[PDB]
Ligand binder design. Structure first.
Ligand code: CO8
Ligand code: CO8
Ligand code: CO8
Ligand code: CO8
Ligand code: FAD
Ligand code: FAD
Ligand code: FAD
Ligand code: FAD
Lengths: 385, 385, 385, 385
């Protein structure tokens, strides 16, 4: 039977995440956007609150939460700032591969350490020449005795220069004609390994306090015991990762949509034009209505997709719907939020212009808007074919 | 926690409704749209199958199903023909008022009959001069000893010429400055009462097999025992009704969207142009994807709204979101479906132009797209104010 | 220098077209939609008014008007009814090929006769298996001595069963590998020729009084002197035809958008809800505003495209923009027009539901919405390549 | 008849503006957005080139160009940077009032100086408490013998800290029940007048090189000879100004749309994914097509609006359509352009995220998207009423 009711435990995680988001993140999110520092103090706290690495199984000192849980928490954090929240989320991204494709030993060693200190990790797939086309990746891995030799370059890595270790997808089969399903290998690469050249901090339009860099791998030596399931099983792990990790990215976008909604509404209830409150102009109340409608829909789609995977079923279809839809409305609301503010909305002393800048990324990373329509269409047709 | 899982009981109604809709409705739907006959044989069948009057409590020989159940069923019926489904739902519409504001004697008598014979009923609010503005209604109810004299005209009444009895909203407080909450009285009126003048069958663009007529009420005598809760409680019963009754109309709209999607998909997997299957042109695959996205989103919204009211809480906000969103996407899908059929889609021998004609009403009846925004805004704003 | 000013001659054509459209077409357009007769009386009058075949050069007794002229006149006619107007427009469609690819003799004989009586003609390209893909046409033409032998079937021919003669595109080169630019031939085929089997009147959603039928060609013998420019020049003539003929189809759609706009506005200025005129609700006035905006834009795009060809330049790009855009807004306005009418809009006694049904075709024939985006994109890229 | 043909004179300004914009603006635009410096060297150049103060009559050493001319130029400038272009247009904004409501002495003095030196001016209407509602302004103008005492605050003034003189709209009628048409007076005020307190430079999301500040006016003394037409004629000069001045803002928006389109196209013809050029994915070709459609449509609308006013007729209706439509599509194109750049589009080293930040203002200044609908509606409705 249907249920849209949170558990008391969930209600508590949510309250914690909300309180920290609004009491700690909000008051400083603006300064961090301006300066573009790494929000170390915030991450630290988030760690102590147990609002990071939430998905690490209990066996490794983790909380062992589900995808539903992460979404719930990450909707709250995103509300404060998606710059900060992205830092946090990236940790889970680099961890999932391990959780779903790692052995006890690999898990214990790399997931275990995240539990002990406030360490960070990153997910390295994208390259200058390939992002959407993962099968177009050119980073190569060559087996030499008991180790692998990694040569290649990765681009746009969140937590790029702050990561303890990286999950790294490389092409292990040189045969150009080798199929995607057996041409790649997933590795755990320690950032301190000789040969990893961390690039400069890339300066983007939004999520400015987030660390995004390119990375070069020059003859990096990785022990075979850092291969995750085996040689060739790299593609499947990547794909399997997006299904658990898309819902939470959808939840971030409807956090940033909720913020926009809250700001717009509050303002409309204060500002007057032509003798009436903004909210009293039918054209504005209609915009607020439309805005509200979208947030609820998008919150509803990520819950569906998260529940699906938590139930132990493939959620590719629902996850893409969620990421596709959540990304679009966060973008729509962001722009509609500065509109409501008028001249003030375009101004940097107000909180909505930041939102409009942060929102854009949701339509690009973790599978572009267009890539999502490719997945959905393929998954959709599959039921008539 | 969350659950998007049907009960084994709900799975069975669902199967029943589906089989009925695809084996019995679909094959004749087209020929009822053309002739505009009342689908008598279909309604009888739906009654026997127990896919009608689903909300009548057990005490009066009903199934005493919830709103989640009604929705589930409706979505299956609507897939077949919303012309036929609208006939069915009109029944639930006239019944609800009776269920939420009637006494045992009233329910026993009027609800009890619905459970004995395949009888129909109708909801009479709308007038020539007022639809959206139900505070604008002018049909008067004047107290004359132990009865009320009713004078007025109702317009666009579903089942108007086929109902055994009517729920009738009338103005009982003559004072123009009287508030809505106290100026109207709800009555249950038997169609055979002298003075009720049923008009001709109205020819509309869609849902042509549905019976919708105008009704004149001159000097209609109604016993005081037919007053629903009390004089003045009219307004509240009406609004109370829309909350229970908005979700199922939404579900009807995402059934007519599912159908559109199924037809378009099947066609896209057969027709060829420029050497490729329609589904192979990225232009079309993207269109199909957006279509699936909206169906899933709309389904989720009515589910939420239904669960809410079943849980014992007022769902005005969620109900209006679902009604408004489902309504819009039904209309978008209908036209896009006609579009991937090309030239054949404009033709009467293919099933999608009916869908297009049918869909338009969803943005009008049971609270107009604009009226839905008014409600959402009001409900939304009240959480900040 | 810029000028959006009509010539006095143009002002006069317009006045004539407007007066006839509103005094003769409107009062009977509804009855013709219902019955689906051919509006013979109207066509007759239109002929006498000199509102038909407007593009026939003066040399053949024609008025020799330009594309700007046709658009202007046809915007006025379409306002009355696109069912009727389509009949008229089809004449020009079948004539253009002749005007641009025929010799003095062919022109004199077939264009000349249109000037003498109120005859009709049709354009035959589309087949059951191919519409959008003209190069996919299978009607074959085989040269036998001094004549050609035509075998094949055409579908969806406007004026199909009322045409004196037809322009007919057939594949004259059996080599499957033969290029589009030399594989087809354009013919003038007299309807009375033994072997042409006119099909039944197809029943569609809109433009119901228009004659649309499929046609079979069984060993039809056509004199070589009915070939238009020569064997192989068939494709180019077809393509060349759409460029002169798209603007006027765009003008029809913004005629049907203007009607919708006029009806919606008038109604909004009469109907009251919640004490105010519809026009006084900001949400409605905003809809009317948006509606007005679209019509002006679309009228502006067809004028650009018509002027382009009249200046003796290739207008493929502007023509597609116009047809694409005009088709979409007519559709948007049609639905927004019934919305404004409320319950009445869905009703067949009101004039907007017809409009919503008529409008859909604009997105399909004379190059689908999708096909237009293909042309535009190709023409657009061409300027950077 | 119709003409979409530029004069040989207009072709030359156009070339001049284009060359300036691509050879001088583009190369430094990026570095002015980052530093937010006033583009002094660029403005000087524009002045020498004669691409500034274009509307000043010949009598005062001007070019005495029309609105069509201004638009043509502006579109070219805006293509480069609307940050820089906005500085330029602000000049024309403060000048117009003077041109339509000033005497010879006023024009000679204040317009004459603009033609001698590369001086700037500003338009001062907007206040902290009122922007959209210019009848809501509170800066008072009190008559004191032969001068007026001005008290109030202006907000968001373009060129506010760089202008030689200001056009200043003030309330001269203290009576609250006084009509807009008689309650305001227009003044020309010299920036060096004791009492004018220019605020700090405001940091906005876009058009960062543009100077926009708040200004306090306490006990500012203005000679009666600086009153534009007469006491009370303020309102009408202001509205009169927007009509001449809306078209060019529209043109600025379709320059920033043209740029977005050019960048996206160029990129789509270089980047490869899944073995094909971005432009080769139908998904993208369709997006590109829609983009081109809107640019062409918006260009046409400002042309129409400009021609109208140049023809000597009130263009309120057309001006607002152009402002509203151009504004919207500039915003749609900016985000779609960022989209086909993928990850690089979010990065500061690529030219499209600036476009996105820049574009948002177009939906706010010079009459808000909502205010434009109000005007269109009013203008539209008045043709039936
Ligand atoms: C907020 C969080 C903070 C961090 C933010 C930053 C995070 C990021 O941006 S990471 C982003 C990385 N970039 C991407 O997301 C791009 C992803 N793009 C894709 O998903 C793919 O390229 C996609 C789905 C289009 C597939 O392309 P394609 O080349 O055709 O492979 P395809 O042929 O479909 O499949 C190959 C094999 O994989 C399998 N496969 C495909 N999809 C899936 C799936 N979803 N699940 C499982 N297996 C799959 C197939 O079954 C196939 O197997 P086999 O050989 O046995 O038949
Ligand atoms: C598929 C099925 C087949 C049949 C299909 C055909 C069925 C139909 O088409 S019937 C069409 C339905 N028509 C409509 O829904 C019209 C929409 N109209 C409305 O909902 C309302 O009039 C609406 C929302 C616009 C409000 O206008 P208004 O007249 O000003 O009432 P308002 O002043 O807001 O409220 C008056 C009182 O009602 C109360 N009220 C309002 N909404 C509610 C509610 N949801 N629950 C309880 N009370 C409510 C208010 O609290 C207020 O009370 P109080 O005095 O105690 O404070
Ligand atoms: C209101 C009026 C009443 C009547 C209403 C009813 C009227 C109708 O519906 S008639 C509708 C007929 N159906 C259509 O409109 C479908 C039209 N579809 C098309 O336009 C095309 O198929 C189209 C443009 C996609 C081209 O496809 P394609 O197969 O790739 O041909 P393509 O390779 O582009 O070109 C082949 C040759 O034609 C030329 N060509 C292509 N487009 C054009 C053009 N616009 N102008 C001139 N030449 C052209 C090419 O240059 C090429 O030449 P070459 O061999 O010398 O290099
Ligand atoms: C790119 C350039 C760089 C610089 C960029 C920065 C520039 C800027 O941002 S300045 C921003 C501009 N701000 C605006 O445009 C705000 C929009 N506000 C308005 O236009 C109006 O206030 C508007 C349309 C809402 C009307 O509200 P309202 O106060 O009620 O006036 P209203 O009552 O309608 O009319 C009052 C009188 O004015 C007259 N009026 C209205 N419009 C006009 C007009 N276009 N022409 C002449 N008279 C007019 C009416 O006729 C009426 O007169 P009367 O008494 O004789 O009958
Ligand atoms: C701030 C930021 C953080 C990021 N974090 C990470 C990270 O931690 N780890 C990581 O691995 N990556 C990360 N990414 C990269 C991100 O995953 C990619 O940018 C995204 O997948 C898009 O790929 P791309 O940039 O190569 O664009 P491209 O793939 O080149 O695409 C360009 C455009 O073409 C479209 N397109 C491409 N292929 C097709 C097709 N077949 N059909 C239709 N349209 C198509 C795309 O939609 C896009 O609009 C990050 C990027 C950014 C900007
Ligand atoms: C086939 C059919 C079946 C029906 N079945 C029933 C039934 O069984 N029982 C019954 O009682 N009624 C029924 N109705 C009537 C239906 O509920 C109304 O038509 C619908 O509520 C719209 O009201 P209206 O027709 O009066 O339009 P109006 O209320 O006159 O409104 C006209 C337009 O103005 C807009 N509008 C109105 N007020 C506002 C406002 N304040 N702000 C902004 N926009 C506004 C509306 O969106 C609409 O577009 C039926 C109608 C149809 C066509
Ligand atoms: C009332 C009516 C009157 C008509 N009058 C005439 C007439 O007088 N003369 C005449 O010759 N024809 C006429 N036509 C036919 C009309 O030209 C075609 O119906 C139209 O071109 C569409 O082709 P189709 O029906 O084959 O659809 P298809 O070409 O089969 O297309 C089906 C769907 O797929 C899409 N599609 C097809 N190819 C592609 C592609 N490569 N990329 C992306 N999407 C694609 C189309 O957009 C459409 O949505 C008429 C049609 C109608 C309905
Ligand atoms: C960079 C910049 C430069 C500027 N340059 C100048 C300049 O040179 N000179 C000058 O005088 N001003 C200038 N402006 C100010 C600009 O004109 C106003 O900000 C714009 O008119 C919006 O007014 P507002 O900010 O007061 O928003 P408000 O008027 O407060 O409105 C807030 C929101 O409510 C909506 N709204 C308001 N009234 C209604 C209504 N009746 N119905 C429906 N919706 C409504 C608006 O759409 C908006 O979304 C500038 C502003 C900026 C940001």
């Amino acid at each position: 039977g249907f249920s849209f009711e949170l558990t008391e435990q969930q209600k508590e995680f949510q309250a914690t995440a909300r309180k920290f988001a609004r009491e700690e993140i909000i008051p400083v999110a603006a300064e961090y956007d301006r300066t573009g520092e790494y929000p170390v103090p915030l991450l630290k706290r988030a760690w102590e609150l147990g609002l990071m690495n939430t998905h690490i199984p209990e066996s490794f000192g983790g909380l062992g939460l589900g995808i539903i849980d992460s979404c719930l928490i990450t909707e709250e954090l995103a509300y404060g700032c998606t710059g900060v929240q992205t830092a946090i989320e990236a940790n889970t991204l680099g961890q999932v591969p391990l959780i779903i494709g790692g052995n006890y030993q690999q898990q214990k060693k790399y997931l275990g350490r995240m539990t002990e200190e406030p360490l960070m990790c990153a997910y390295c797939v994208t390259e200058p020449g390939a992002g959407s086309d993962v099968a177009g990746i050119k980073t190569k891995a060559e087996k030499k005795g008991d180790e692998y030799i990694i040569n290649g370059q990765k681009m746009w890595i969140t937590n790029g220069g702050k990561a303890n270790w990286y999950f790294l997808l490389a092409r292990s089969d040189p045969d150009p004609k080798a199929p995607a399903s057996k041409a790649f290998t997933g590795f755990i690469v320690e950032a301190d390994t000789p040969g990893v050249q961390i690039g400069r901090k890339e300066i983007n339009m939004g999520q400015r306090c987030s660390d995004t860099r390119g990375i070069v791998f020059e003859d990096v030596r990785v022990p075979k015991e850092n291969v995750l399931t085996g040689e060739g099983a790299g593609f499947k792990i990547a794909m399997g990762t997006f299904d658990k990790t898309r819902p939470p990215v959808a939840a971030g976008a409807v956090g940033l949509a909720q913020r926009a909604l809250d700001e717009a509404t509050k303002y409309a209830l204060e500002r007057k034009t032509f003798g009436k409150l903004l909210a009293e102009h039918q054209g504005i109340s209609f915009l607020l209505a439309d805005m509200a409608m979208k947030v609820e829909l998008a919150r509803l789609s990520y819950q569906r997709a998260a529940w699906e995977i938590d139930s132990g079923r493939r959620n590719t279809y629902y996850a893409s719907i969620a990421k596709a839809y959540a990304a679009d409305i966060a973008n729509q609301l962001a722009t509609d939020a500065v509109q409501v503010f008028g001249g003030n909305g375009f101004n940097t002393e107000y909180p909505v212009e930041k939102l409009m800048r942060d929102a854009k990324i949701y339509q690009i990373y973790e599978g572009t808007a267009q890539i999502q329509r490719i997945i959905i269409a393929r998954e959709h047709i599959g039921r008539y074919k």
